[model samples]
Target: GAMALKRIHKELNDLARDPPAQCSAGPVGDDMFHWQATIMGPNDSPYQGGVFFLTIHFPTDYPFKPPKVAFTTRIYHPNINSNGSICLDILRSQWSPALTISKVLLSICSLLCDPNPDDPLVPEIARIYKTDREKYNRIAREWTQKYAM
Candidate 1:
């Protein structure tokens, strides 16, 4: 617990010193284990002009384990489900202790710009993304205006 707490504190200080582009994060209240984050939509993506919120929860063994991250704001994307669960490798199978919240949030920002329709959490959205690119972009933009803006 002591080790995890120290690491978390160091991460918080690092974030304050040099935050990621279009993203920001910090603990929620006095609980260092729970945090809230925000990611601005990538300029080249359909989600542009929107601000997406996400929640993060660090496990007791954090740094050794990936943080639990999920979007709190609704977004229309193939790899993200309606429930806000994200299908990203680094958060799961590819997780490494060297990865930090800054890196993870940046990865998600990249995901927004380039979605992996091949392995999607929402199959229906994936199909649209694969077959009708224009339509997919339109809906994603509309959703961003309706829900994220």
Candidate 2:
């Protein structure tokens, strides 16, 4: 019971202390389970300056279950869907109690670097990633330059 509260407090502090590269985050006063995050695409990538909003929902049994985090801002990536449902295991089945909110964010950042093609959320994008890396990079960069800029 108290553990969840402790984590919420910790997450709030963590977000304030070391927020993700292009993102700002805060909890909703009305709902402790809900948090809002806005991330800018990484500098070297197409998402630079592009602000992507996300929503995170923590289970009552959190720590045991990773918070359900998803993008509200639309993005195009092999692991992310139109609705922002990430195909990353850390956010799902492979999640561990040792992971923190910041850790999850970092994993997401890394996801931008190496998409898990084996478990793709966007099949076509993953295909492009495998068959035509340059075009994929270009489009990802284009998306960042166009929307994020």
Candidate 3:
């Protein structure tokens, strides 16, 4: 318990000292284990001009295990479902202790830039992306304007 708190504090300080671009995260309420994050849509993607929210929960043995992260703001993407669950390797099997929340957020930004349609959370969206790329971008932009703006 002590070790986890210590590590979390260290990460918090590091984030405050040198925060990642277009991303911000901090504890929610009085619980350090529960956090809220915001990600500005990547400029090169259809989601640009939107602000996305996410929730993060660190386990008692954080850093040793990956944090639970999910979108709070709705976004349209093949790798993200309506329920806000994200499909990313680092959040799952590819997780490593060395990876930080800042890195994870950056990876998410990259995911927005280049979605993994082959490994999709929303197969329907992935299908559209593969069949009609322009339509996919249009819908994604529409959703971003409607829900994320």
Candidate 4:
């Protein structure tokens, strides 16, 4: 069970009224749990101008649990894999019911802004990002240009 139809209905209207501010996420069809998303690179990052795509697979119960989300759009970052999967704490133990799909994506934008090296998926990138910030930024920009758009 996810948001009630009325609630989902309301959310759709809200999104149309006041979009998420960065990206768009919604179910592909009648099945509400299988959603596809499109995001523009955060304006502040090298990802800017790049369009990102994501797939979210919510379990029968959503909000109660974080959906399984992965980027389908290729990206290069210290935490996102070449396969489009991401390393986000929210999808793990850090999740709470207070989090919503919109929040999850904003968090990803924040992740793009500030990568957490304490826990990393691409440790080499993380290490470079920590030790050689400029190099890391350049690589991220390059990757964004090459893969993300």
Kindly list the per-residue Cα lDDT of model 2 for residues 1-149, writing each as its tens digit.
67887887787898788756555667767777788876667767656667777788888888888999998767779998988798888887889988977787778877876789798778899999999988998888777666544
Instruction: Identify the runs in model 3 with alpha carbons over 4 angstroms from their true place.
Output: none
Better of 2 and 3 by TM-score: 3
Best by lDDT: 1
lDDT of 3: 0.91
What tens-digit string does per-residue lDDT give for candidate 4 at 1-149?
Answer: 43644444555566678798778988888867687888888876778888888998876655667778999877768898877778888998998767777878889888988888777788798888889988887777887788676
Residue 105 CA displacement from its true place in model 4, Å? 0.8
- Please give, for residues 1-149, the per-residue lDDT of candidate 1 as tens digits: 99999999999999999967699999999999999999998998899899999999999999999999999999989999889999999999999999999899989999999997567899999999999999999999999999998
| Over 4 Å off, model 1 | none
Q: What is the lDDT of every predicted structure here?
A: 0.93, 0.79, 0.91, 0.79
lDDT of 2 at 131: 99
lDDT of 3 by residue, 19-117 (tens): 786999989988999999999998978999999999999999988899999998998899999889999999999999899888989999999899995
TM-score of each: 0.97, 0.88, 0.97, 0.88
By TM-score rank, best first, the candidates go: 1, 3, 2, 4
